[PDB]
Structure formats: structure tokens, C-alpha cells
């Protein structure tokens, strides 16, 4: 009569690496490495990403004439841009502190576009039409940005303008505007009359002055002039005051804001879906509760630590010796 001591074996083919030995077959194991993605750009924290289509942050903010559809947003957890997202600053020029703005707007709660300085109303004594260009062309015809107004002279006369706005929104107001720098002193006159103009913007925490930088430069989109865009965040209760004698690409539309904690922008061609996720990568969402992933270093959300491993399989069972 006998009795034997012994251990479990099975049909398992799982392998784990140990410190003394590579590739050991074990009866049971768990994976510690996430290496599969979702294929889709998912909702982050209940909310969906802002999609911009063929426009980039600049074009959508400025109101490039190609972004007439995505005039649709209300609150987003992060922003998506695609390979086909080049409609932005159509009139050549520099967008000041652009990366910063892009960073700030990356998540937002209550977001209203509104009419700050109404076109046919706010600017008497000035020429509100004819402020269009072939650079910013719509349906073949020359047009302009939908959110900005290109104020030009009215019968050879540009009287110093002093328009002001008070923030009764109870939230931040993002105000953009631009300053036009003509190519030569000749256009400076046919456009804004006053040979020596200036644009001045002032609020509580913002005081900058701008001045016409007239010069000869190559044509970008068949334009020798340039247009610099500027923004600022007006605090609830504050007043912003535009005072100019020419070169002012005035606000027409502004935005009301509750800025988000701290998200980011992701650039991907993956399809957005109605699904949820705590970790978002450029190629797709990562259903992740495991400590490590090897799908992508850039990420948004509560994400496993990115790692360059291929295999992080951790033994739970014992050495599997079925002895066939």
C-alpha cells in the first residue's frame, strides 16, 4: 500500500521568462502588458472629442470659410485633428501664441460662440463690406473669415474707432482679432487712408499696441500683405477696448468659455465612436487596467505606463511538466 506526493500538470502552453531561464512552460499565467487597441477615437470621461474635419484649431476659431459645418460644439474632452486638416490661416500671417491657445482649449465645458461686435451696426463711420479677399475665397468668390471683420476706409476717411465690450457672460470670453500689414505704403492709403495708423487693445490684464509693418515680401496664396492674429481671455466682469485708426481686423464673433482642467490634442485618422475609455492613444482607445502598454507613448487619460517590451507574461501556476 502506497501514497505519493505530486503536482498539477496540464495542456497549457503558456510561457514566461524567468531570470535564470528563458521560455518556461507553466500551467497558468496572467498578462501584465496591454498590446491591443480599439481602432476608434473614444469618449474620454463621458464626453466626446471635438472634431474639426478639414479645418485646424486656427481655421475653426478664425472662421475660415471652409469650416461652415463644424460650427457645432458644446463641450469636449479633447480635440482631434486629422491628416486632412489644413484649412486654417488662409490670409498669410502669424497666429500669436498659437500652441498655447491650442493647449488651453484642449478641453472645455460650456462653450458659446456669440456676436460680440455686430457687423451691420457696430461700425458706422467705416466700411464694413468690401473687406474680402481671394486668399480667403468661398465657392470661387472672394470672401473672408466668418468671425472677423475687415474694416476698411469709408470715402477716403478712417476716423479713430473706439469700440468696447463688457463681459456679462459670467465666464471667460475668448476674443480674437488681427492686424493687417499691407505690402507697400501705396496700399496703406487706398485701404486705411491714415498713413500712420495704429491698433490698440486694452483690458485689465492686457495692454498691447500694434503698428503697421509695411514691407516687400514674397506672395503667399498670392498675397504680399500679411495678417497677424491675436487672442486674449477676458475675465467675467472685465472690459476690452479696441481703439484703431486703420489695419484693424476687428472681432465680429467671440467665444464664451469654461476652460478644462488639462487635456491635449490628438492627431489621428481613426474614426470617432460613441464608446467610452479611460486611456486614449492616436491609433485607438486602450481598454486598460493592466500596469503597462506598448501601443503608444503619447496618450490622454489614465493610462498604463508605456513600455518597449513585447511580452510581460507573469507566471501564476507552476512549471508545466505533463510528461506525455
Amino acid at each position: 500500500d502506497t501514497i505519493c506526493i505530486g503536482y498539477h500538470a496540464n495542456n497549457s502552453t503558456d510561457t514566461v521568462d524567468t531570470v535564470l531561464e528563458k521560455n518556461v512552460t507553466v500551467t497558468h499565467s496572467v498578462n501584465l502588458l496591454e498590446d491591443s487597441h480599439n481602432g476608434k477615437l473614444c469618449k474620454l470621461k463621458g464626453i466626446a472629442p471635438l472634431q474639426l474635419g478639414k479645418c485646424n484649431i486656427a481655421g475653426w476659431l478664425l472662421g475660415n470659410p471652409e469650416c461652415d459645418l463644424l460650427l457645432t460644439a458644446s463641450s469636449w474632452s479633447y480635440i482631434v485633428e486629422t491628416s486632412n486638416s489644413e484649412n486654417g490661416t488662409c490670409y498669410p500671417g502669424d497666429f500669436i501664441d498659437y500652441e498655447e491657445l491650442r493647449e488651453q482649449l484642449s478641453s472645455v465645458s460650456s462653450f458659446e460662440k456669440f456676436e460680440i461686435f455686430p457687423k451691420t451696426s457696430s461700425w458706422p463711420n467705416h466700411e464694413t463690406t468690401k473687406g474680402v479677399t481671394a486668399a480667403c475665397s468661398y465657392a470661387g468668390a472672394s470672401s473672408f473669415y466668418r468671425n472677423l471683420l475687415w474694416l476698411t476706409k469709408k470715402g477716403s476717411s478712417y476716423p479713430k474707432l473706439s469700440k468696447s465690450y463688457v463681459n456679462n457672460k459670467g465666464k471667460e470670453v475668448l476674443v480674437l482679432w488681427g492686424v493687417h500689414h499691407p505690402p507697400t505704403g501705396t496700399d496703406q492709403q487706398s485701404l486705411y487712408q491714415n498713413a500712420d495708423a495704429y491698433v490698440s487693445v486694452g483690458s485689465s490684464k492686457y495692454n498691447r499696441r500694434f503698428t503697421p509693418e509695411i514691407a516687400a515680401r514674397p506672395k503667399v496664396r498670392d498675397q504680399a500683405g500679411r495678417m497677424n492674429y491675436y487672442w486674449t481671455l477676458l475675465e467675467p466682469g472685465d472690459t476690452i477696448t479696441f481703439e484703431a485708426t486703420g489695419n484693424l481686423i476687428a472681432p465680429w464673433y467671440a467665444f464664451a468659455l469654461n476652460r478644462g482642467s488639462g487635456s491635449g490634442i490628438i492627431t489621428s485618422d481613426a474614426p470617432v465612436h460613441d464608446c467610452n475609455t479611460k486611456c486614449q492613444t492616436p491609433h485607438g482607445a486602450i481598454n486598460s487596467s493592466l500596469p503597462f502598454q506598448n501601443i503608444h507613448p503619447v496618450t490622454i487619460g489614465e493610462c498604463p505606463k508605456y513600455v518597449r517590451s513585447t511580452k510581460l507574461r507573469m507566471a501564476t501556476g507552476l512549471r508545466n511538466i505533463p510528461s506525455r
Binding site: 501514497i3 506526493i5 498539477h8 524567468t18 531570470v19 501584465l32 500596469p291 489614465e302 505606463k305
Partner: protein, 160 residues
């Protein structure tokens, strides 16, 4: 392994035994049979489980955050960002890779330990009533039935 039991003096495993990780065979006059040692198998499972939860639960889950965007005059900051990200990458890879390796060695040694300790727990119960054959087998001098078998695997036996 480190305790020389699994793939050691007990050369192979039992696909037959399926109720647990460690256990007894036994061949009686009333038939052969496998039985798992419930006590040690559970103890082991609670341990391995805790082990796995430590390695997964202890990770301080990131809390949103991307990488950043810089213009053509911010190359130095761009690269600092890259250095940071690549820095974390090398550290997480190395530590992840080695952690799993150590944990694995430890785990297999853990099981080796549990088998050995079970063998020695039986050995020091039977004493001079059984003959140590090998491969973890004891052969009885007193020819014992399914009732006694259960006392042995149950820890009661008794009869130095």
C-alpha cells in the same frame, strides 16, 4: 528548482490531479486515486493572488496627460520633453522587464517550496511505518485502507 522537488526528486506532474496544485496519489486495496491537498493549494492561491494584485494595484495610474506641441523656435524645449518621455520609457521598460523576471523565478520557487514542505510534512508523520521509495512516494509497512489514507492527507494519521 531551488528546493529540488518539482522537476527534481519528484520528476513529473500529474494531469490526473485536477482539484488543486499539490496533492497525493495513493494506491490502496480499494483502488488508486488522486486528491488535492486543499490546505496548501488554497494558501498558495491566496499568495499568488496577492502577488498579482500587488504588481497591478500598486501602479499609481496616470491621470490624463499627453505630450506637448512646440514651434520651430522651441527646439530645445521640444527635445527636453522628448528626453523626459524617453527617460520614463527606459526606466519603465527596464523595471517592468526585470520585475516580471524576478517575480517569476520567485513564484516557481514558491511552488517548489510548497511541494517539498508537503512531502516532508507526510514523511515526518509516517516515520518508520513507511519506506521512502522516491518520486515522492512512501510505501506502507502496515497496509492501510481508504480511512487511514484520509487520515494521512488530513494530517491526523498517528502511530510513530
Amino acid at each position: 528548482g531551488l528546493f529540488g522537488a518539482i522537476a527534481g526528486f519528484i520528476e513529473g506532474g500529474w494531469t490526473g490531479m485536477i482539484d488543486g496544485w499539490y496533492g497525493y496519489h495513493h494506491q490502496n486495496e480499494q483502488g488508486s486515486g488522486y486528491a488535492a491537498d486543499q490546505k496548501s493549494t488554497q494558501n498558495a492561491i491566496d499568495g499568488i493572488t496577492n502577488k498579482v494584485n500587488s504588481v497591478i494595484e500598486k501602479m499609481n495610474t496616470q491621470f490624463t496627460a499627453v505630450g506637448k506641441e512646440f514651434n520651430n523656435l522651441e527646439r530645445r524645449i521640444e527635445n527636453l520633453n522628448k528626453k523626459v518621455d524617453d527617460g520614463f520609457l527606459d526606466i519603465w521598460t527596464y523595471n517592468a522587464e526585470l520585475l516580471v523576471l524576478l517575480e517569476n523565478e520567485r513564484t516557481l520557487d514558491f511552488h517548489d517550496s510548497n511541494v517539498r514542505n508537503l512531502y516532508e510534512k507526510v514523511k515526518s508523520q509516517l516515520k518508520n511505518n513507511a519506506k521512502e521509495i522516491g518520486n515522492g512516494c512512501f510505501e506502507f509497512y502496515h497496509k492501510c485502507d481508504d480511512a487511514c489514507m484520509e487520515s494521512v492527507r488530513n494530517g491526523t494519521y498517528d502511530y510513530p
